[PDB]
Scaffold this active site. Structure first.
Site, PDB file in Angstrom:
ATOM      1  N   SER A 133       2.441   2.020  19.019  1.00  0.00           N
ATOM      2  CA  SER A 133       2.232   3.390  18.314  1.00  0.00           C
ATOM      3  C   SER A 133       3.602   3.970  18.398  1.00  0.00           C
ATOM      4  O   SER A 133       4.318   4.299  19.557  1.00  0.00           O
ATOM      5  CB  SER A 133       1.543   4.292  19.257  1.00  0.00           C
ATOM      6  OG  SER A 133       1.454   5.609  18.598  1.00  0.00           O
ATOM      7  N   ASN A 172       2.219   0.964   7.412  1.00  0.00           N
ATOM      8  CA  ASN A 172       1.030   0.421   7.382  1.00  0.00           C
ATOM      9  C   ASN A 172       0.161   1.510   7.004  1.00  0.00           C
ATOM     10  O   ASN A 172      -0.436   1.932   8.073  1.00  0.00           O
ATOM     11  CB  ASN A 172       0.697  -0.529   8.319  1.00  0.00           C
ATOM     12  CG  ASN A 172      -0.398  -1.242   8.115  1.00  0.00           C
ATOM     13  OD1 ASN A 172      -1.171  -1.277   6.928  1.00  0.00           O
ATOM     14  ND2 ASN A 172      -0.889  -1.769   9.247  1.00  0.00           N
ATOM     15  N   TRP A 173      -0.361   1.771   5.880  1.00  0.00           N
ATOM     16  CA  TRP A 173      -1.451   2.838   5.461  1.00  0.00           C
ATOM     17  C   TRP A 173      -2.888   2.078   5.818  1.00  0.00           C
ATOM     18  O   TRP A 173      -3.571   3.180   5.681  1.00  0.00           O
ATOM     19  CB  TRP A 173      -1.371   3.221   4.072  1.00  0.00           C
ATOM     20  CG  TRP A 173      -0.087   4.152   3.758  1.00  0.00           C
ATOM     21  CD1 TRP A 173       1.083   4.382   4.793  1.00  0.00           C
ATOM     22  CD2 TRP A 173       0.383   4.556   2.407  1.00  0.00           C
ATOM     23  NE1 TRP A 173       1.918   5.141   3.858  1.00  0.00           N
ATOM     24  CE2 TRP A 173       1.603   5.164   2.612  1.00  0.00           C
ATOM     25  CE3 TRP A 173      -0.429   4.679   1.163  1.00  0.00           C
ATOM     26  CZ2 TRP A 173       2.211   5.970   1.505  1.00  0.00           C
ATOM     27  CZ3 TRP A 173       0.406   5.559   0.247  1.00  0.00           C
ATOM     28  CH2 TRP A 173       1.506   6.089   0.323  1.00  0.00           C
ATOM     29  N   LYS A 174      -3.002   1.155   6.155  1.00  0.00           N
ATOM     30  CA  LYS A 174      -4.201   0.517   6.523  1.00  0.00           C
ATOM     31  C   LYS A 174      -5.361   1.123   5.277  1.00  0.00           C
ATOM     32  O   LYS A 174      -5.111   0.821   4.091  1.00  0.00           O
ATOM     33  CB  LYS A 174      -4.667   0.776   7.963  1.00  0.00           C
ATOM     34  CG  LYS A 174      -3.349   0.725   8.975  1.00  0.00           C
ATOM     35  CD  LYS A 174      -4.022   0.545  10.375  1.00  0.00           C
ATOM     36  CE  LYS A 174      -3.104   0.144  11.150  1.00  0.00           C
ATOM     37  NZ  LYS A 174      -3.355   0.119  12.818  1.00  0.00           N
ATOM     38  N   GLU A 192       2.984  -6.526  18.042  1.00  0.00           N
ATOM     39  CA  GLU A 192       1.715  -5.582  18.358  1.00  0.00           C
ATOM     40  C   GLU A 192       1.268  -5.766  19.631  1.00  0.00           C
ATOM     41  O   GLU A 192       0.575  -6.721  20.282  1.00  0.00           O
ATOM     42  CB  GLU A 192       0.611  -5.693  17.240  1.00  0.00           C
ATOM     43  CG  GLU A 192       1.105  -5.649  16.091  1.00  0.00           C
ATOM     44  CD  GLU A 192      -0.200  -5.858  15.002  1.00  0.00           C
ATOM     45  OE1 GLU A 192      -0.965  -4.886  15.073  1.00  0.00           O
ATOM     46  OE2 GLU A 192      -0.453  -6.799  14.452  1.00  0.00           O
ATOM     47  N   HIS A 207      -1.579  -9.180  10.556  1.00  0.00           N
ATOM     48  CA  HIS A 207      -1.778  -8.083  11.174  1.00  0.00           C
ATOM     49  C   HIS A 207      -3.163  -8.253  12.265  1.00  0.00           C
ATOM     50  O   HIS A 207      -3.991  -8.766  12.092  1.00  0.00           O
ATOM     51  CB  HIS A 207      -2.146  -6.792  10.594  1.00  0.00           C
ATOM     52  CG  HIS A 207      -2.340  -5.428  11.177  1.00  0.00           C
ATOM     53  ND1 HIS A 207      -3.234  -5.073  11.971  1.00  0.00           N
ATOM     54  CD2 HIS A 207      -1.315  -4.387  11.395  1.00  0.00           C
ATOM     55  CE1 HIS A 207      -3.005  -3.826  12.388  1.00  0.00           C
ATOM     56  NE2 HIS A 207      -1.571  -3.533  12.082  1.00  0.00           N
ATOM     57  N   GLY A 256       1.978   3.153  11.866  1.00  0.00           N
ATOM     58  CA  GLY A 256       0.658   3.594  11.520  1.00  0.00           C
ATOM     59  C   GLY A 256       0.675   4.854  11.094  1.00  0.00           C
ATOM     60  O   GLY A 256       0.902   5.160   9.914  1.00  0.00           O
TER      61      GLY A 256
END
Lengths: 265, 265
Positions: B223, B9-11, B170, B98, B244
């Site tokens: 993470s 997920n490059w956000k 998450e 998300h 991430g």
């Protein structure tokens, strides 16, 4: 001394494939090339997926590019958000902010929108800040309160030397035939007379807050504008363009609007 | 042979299309030599880069994902992206619900539910994220929050589409961010906490969907980096990672992909 206009095309979520967005954008750039538009700026706002390819296709033409939205930070952990830097990377010159769908369907606040407007100006993007009241707000006597609140809070703390980059679009949200936006109220006809009233009110607010710099902010009409009604609306003194919905989805629909603006400038 | 899905997920971390294409190309090359028969790898660039990245990685083993989408195909939704636009770019996956969408941008379970059903109708593979905040965890509401998210985000999904769904858990409660977790102690997430939540999620899915629910892979969405990925991927009910920071370069992501391959023999 001639009247200036900005005609902005908001493609919303109506053009889905990049090939089609590029094809429409190219056809529009070709169509407006010959129109004598020294006093009229024209932009389109494709969806994020098509911005880069469209910007490539219309580079060097008179057709300008806009984002439909953006986040107010440059980068970070914001899944699904688009950076002002990404708009610039695609060649955007404008960004629509605070559109009624963002405010009323997706719950974007004045404080959030204020941050985005300040960011756009920092980045050299020209923000098209949208404001407008719903049917319940209008019917309950809050038109003036809402528009003042939106101006005061969406343009809080803007450096005066950045004000000339700002365009306001007035949306008569009260006139949209959508029970989601307007759940429990009559949906009235958006008349040119109402549009003039609202645009004069917005001009006075901009004069009061900003003085001379405020007289220079163009106010686009953001109600329904098409070939059949554009001349009447664009001829109203305090209407200096249109933020166009369905009629911006093809050069055939948008050309008469641009022609009317050119004739009046 | 244990299966894994490793999703990047490059956000809003990669702003320019050229950088997004370069990283994606590097990653597609990196994984081409790795035997990834039981490990699917995807990246989720921002909307502006999807089309160009999809072009650059066509025919490789690297799959493409959107970070979000709207639940309608087309219409008057300024700033939204259609599932058809994701498909047009080459997307096989879409991240939905998300924590940043739910907790910063206020996406409800009912909205996310419509997006999940839309994704399935379109043949996209949804990565449905769930997770509780520090306040919710500290008040003893972890199970109620995850069950509510699962029940309401997955409502009315046809049983025969259920094999396309991936869940990502998450631990929002572990995020060092006072906006997300304002009035609670922020604790670092542990593999033992991860395993507890993943097992609970597995139990709920089997309770709702029987055998179809056993087959839904659950990514860990806390993470995950080279230094801790093997311990996490090693947990029975962790079948991948929604990554991430470590997905932003091939160098950072390759050891996670290599760990998943080692554990999938």
């Amino acid at each position: 001394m001639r009247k200036k206009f900005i005609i902005g095309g908001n493609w919303k979520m109506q053009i889905l494939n990049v090939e089609e967005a590029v094809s429409i954008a190219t056809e529009l750039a070709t169509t407006i090339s010959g129109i004598l538009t020294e006093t009229v700026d024209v932009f389109i706002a494709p969806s994020f997926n098509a911005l880069y390819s469209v910007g490539q296709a219309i580079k060097g033409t008179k057709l300008k590019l806009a984002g439909q939205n953006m986040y107010f930070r440059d980068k970070g952990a914001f899944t699904g958000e688009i950076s002002p830097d990404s708009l610039l990377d695609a060649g955007c010159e404008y960004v629509i902010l605070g559109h009624s769908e963002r405010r009323r369907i997706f719950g974007e606040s004045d404080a959030v929108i204020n941050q985005k407007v300040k960011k756009a100006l920092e980045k050299g993007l020209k923000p098209v800040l949208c404001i407008g009241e719903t049917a319940k707000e209008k019917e309950e006597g809050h038109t003036e309160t809402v528009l003042r609140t939106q101006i005061d809070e969406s343009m809080a703390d803007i450096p005066r030397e950045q004000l000339n980059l700002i365009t306001i679009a007035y949306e008569p949200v009260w006139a949209i035939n959508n029970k989601f936006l307007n759940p429990n109220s009559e949906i009235k006809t958006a008349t040119p007379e109402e549009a003039e009233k609202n645009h004069i009110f917005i001009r006075k607010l901009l004069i009061n807050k900003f003085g001379d710099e405020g007289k220079n902010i163009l106010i686009q009409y953001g109600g329904s504008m098409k070939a059949s009604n554009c001349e009447g609306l664009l001829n109203i003194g305090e209407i200096n363009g249109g933020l166009i919905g369905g009629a911006s989805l093809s050069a055939e629909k948008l050309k008469p609007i641009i022609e009317a603006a050119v004739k009046l400038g």
